[PDB]
Structure 1
Amino acid sequence: MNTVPFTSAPIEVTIGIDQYSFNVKENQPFHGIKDIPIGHVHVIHFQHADNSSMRYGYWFDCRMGNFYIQYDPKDGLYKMMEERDGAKFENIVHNFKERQMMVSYPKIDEDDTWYNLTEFVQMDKIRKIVRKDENQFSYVDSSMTTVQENELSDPAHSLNYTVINFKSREAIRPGHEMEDFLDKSYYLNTVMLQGIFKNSSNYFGELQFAFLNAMFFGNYGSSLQWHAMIELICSSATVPKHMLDKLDEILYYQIKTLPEQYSDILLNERVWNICLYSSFQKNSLHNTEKIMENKYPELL
């Protein structure tokens, strides 16, 4: 287990860690999050009491260093930082644990939700999508735009997701116009999987990361990217059997974890109806179809 201590909590804020969240009052004695499961990426995130505008947060892996949070009264936010002095850190932590001023990452032993949502998400790939190489952790917020959104403005602050565009030359082979548009297998398997992502694991990792940024920060570009990566698989007649089965598991746990009262904004009707009912893979997503039907039959 690992720990992310906090210097203090000077402004009232709702703090999340992964799918958990708790309210901290102005100057309430609060010093950290402990018992963080090692072996997964994690996201700590923040919504201030006074300006629910800007949800923001930090993607990190406790294996890559010791990280802590400290509020900055100039820039007005909770910032993640790395402590290099290993003994300083263990000392800080142990003292805060001794004072029982940390919230315990509250994992039910039965529960695999977080693993299932982050199964293919690696810090190395996140850091390529979120470019800021001086830090081992990655900042994301509600307002950041994607490389593709920029094309149609600050690039250092962009989400460099893989560009997907169904009416593009990358997607359409000269002379296979109709074939490639109605069956996206060429674009999925040769262009993206073999060419760009190299394997399905890296593809799924980006898909999962896009969903999580949509869910936790209401990032619109991330939601667009999640949906595009789904639609490209569902619109391909030829998908490896192992990808199809795993995709069903992936989407199942994403729809399962989604807030019931956000399905209006975070879910794209057209993509889901096509993906579950009209596309090549209409019948290959039993678990996802099942939970979508019992939980969001209003969208369909």
Structure 2
Amino acid sequence: MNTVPFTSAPIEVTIGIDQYSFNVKENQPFHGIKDIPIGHVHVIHFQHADNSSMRYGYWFDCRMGNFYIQYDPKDGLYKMMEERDGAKFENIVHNFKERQMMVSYPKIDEDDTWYNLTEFVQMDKIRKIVRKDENQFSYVDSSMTTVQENELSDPAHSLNYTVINFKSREAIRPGHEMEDFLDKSYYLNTVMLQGIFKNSSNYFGELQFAFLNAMFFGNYGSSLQWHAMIELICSSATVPKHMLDKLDEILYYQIKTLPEQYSDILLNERVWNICLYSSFQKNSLHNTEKIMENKYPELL
């Protein structure tokens, strides 16, 4: 298990770590999070108590370095930093553990939720979507726009998701206009999977990362990308049969984790009704259909 110590907590804040959230009071003796499961990416996120504007946070993997959080009173936020002095880091963590000033990551034993939400998410792919090469961790916030949004504005502060546009020359072969618009299989299999993502694991990883940024940061561009990547598969007549099976599992756990009171803002009615009831794959997502119909029948 690994640890993200905090220098201190000078401002009252809600700290989320993966699907869990907790509150820290102003100047409380809080010094970080321990027992973080090794083997997955993680996200540590923040919403200030006195200013719920800007959720922000950091994607990281404790296998890539020793990371800690320190508040910056000039920029007004909790910043992630890397400690290169390993013995210093161990000494700090040991002291804070001894004084019981760190909360414990509470991975319950039966629970595969985080694995199920991040199965295909890799830190190396995150760092290509979020470009800041001097850090091993990646900052995301509520307001960051995507490259596609910036085309329809600071490029250095954008989410470089793969652009998906159903009415683009990329998606439509000359001479195959009706075929390619009504059946997205060319665009999914040749353009995206063979050409850009190279395989279904990378595609699924970006889809999962987009969902998590939409849910944890309330990021609009992320929510658009997640829905577009679902609709591209569902609107293709020809999809690798296992790929539909893996998608059903991915979506099932995303819908299970989504907060019910955020269903109005995180779920697009048009897309979900098309995918579940009209699309080529309307019968291929049995688990996701059942959870959607039982948890959010109003959307449908």
Structure 2 alignment gaps of length 5 or more: none
SS of 1:195's partner is helix
CA shift for structure 1 position 260: 0.1
SS at match of 1:263: helix
Q: Structure 1: how far apart are the matches of 2:53 and 2:128?
A: 26
Q: Secondary structure at the match of 1:255?
A: helix
Secondary structure of 1:52's match? strand
1:123-147 Cα shifts (integer Å, max 9, x gaps):
0000000000000000000000000
Q: Which string of whole-angstrom CA distances, capped at 9 and with x for unpartnered residues, describes residues 210-252 of structure 1?
A: 0000000000000000000000000000000110000000000
Determine the C-alpha separation between the residues in 1 that align with 2:16 and 2:171: 39
Measure the CA separation in 1 of the matches of 2:168 and 2:257.
33
Aligned counterparts of 1:28 and 1:218: Cα–Cα separation in 2:
27
Distance 1:270 1:180 in 2: 21
- Hey, what's the Cα distance between the residues in 2 that align with 1:191 and 1:148? 17
Query: Structure 1 residue 21: deviation in Å?
Result: 1.1
Q: What CA deviation, in whole Å up to 9, does each residue of 1:103-155 have, x standing for no partner?
A: 00011100000000000000000000000000000000000000000001000
What is the deviation of 1:7? Answer: 0.2
Shift of 1:292: 0.3
Q: Which runs of 5+ in 1 are unaligned?
A: none
Q: Which whole-Å CA distance do the structure 2 matches of 1:282 and 1:132 have between them?
A: 40
TM-score (norm 1): 1.00
Taking the aligned partners of 1:251 and 1:103, their CA distance within structure 2 comes to: 30
CA distance in 2, matches of 1:26, 1:262: 27
**Matched position secondary structure for 1:265:** helix
Once the two structures are superposed, what CA deviation does each residue of 1:4-62 show, in whole Å capped at 9, x if it has no partner? 00000000000000011110000000001000000000000000000001000000000
Q: Give 3-state SS (helix, strand or coil) of 2:28's partner.
A: coil
Question: What is the CA distance between 1:177 and its match in structure 2?
Answer: 0.1
Q: TM-score, normalised by structure 2?
A: 1.00
Secondary structure of 1:134's aligned partner? coil
CA-CA distance at 1:187 after TM superposition: 0.2
Match of 1:115 in 2: 115
Report the counterpart of residue 19 of structure 1 in structure 2: 19
Cα offset for 1:180? Answer: 0.3
Instruction: State the 1:91 CA deviation.
Output: 0.3
How far did 1:73 drift? 0.2
- Taking the aligned partners of 2:277 and 2:21, their CA distance within structure 1 comes to 35
Q: Report the equivalent of 2:214.
A: 214
Separation of aligned partners in 2, 1:218 and 1:154: 20
SS at match of 1:95: helix
3-state SS of 1:15 partner? strand
After the TM superposition, list the runs of 4 or more consecutive aligned residues in structure 1 that deviate by more than 2 angstroms. none
**1:152-192 residue CA offsets vs partner (Å, 9 max, x unmatched):** 10000000000000000000000000000000000000000
Measure, in 1, the Cα distance between the counterparts of 2:235 and 2:102.
47
Offset from partner CA, 1:68-124 (integer Å, 9 cap, x none): 000000000000000000000000000000000000001110000000000000000
Measured in 2, the distance between the counterparts of 1:242 and 1:137 equals 32
CA distance in structure 1 between the aligned counterparts of 2:93 and 2:57, rounded to whole angstroms:
21
The residue that corresponds to 2:136 in the other structure is 136
The 5-angstrom pairing of residues 172-211 of structure 1 reads 172-211=172-211
CA distance in 2, matches of 1:92, 1:20: 25
What is the alpha-carbon distance in structure 2 between the residues aligned to residue 29 and residue 265 of structure 1? 35
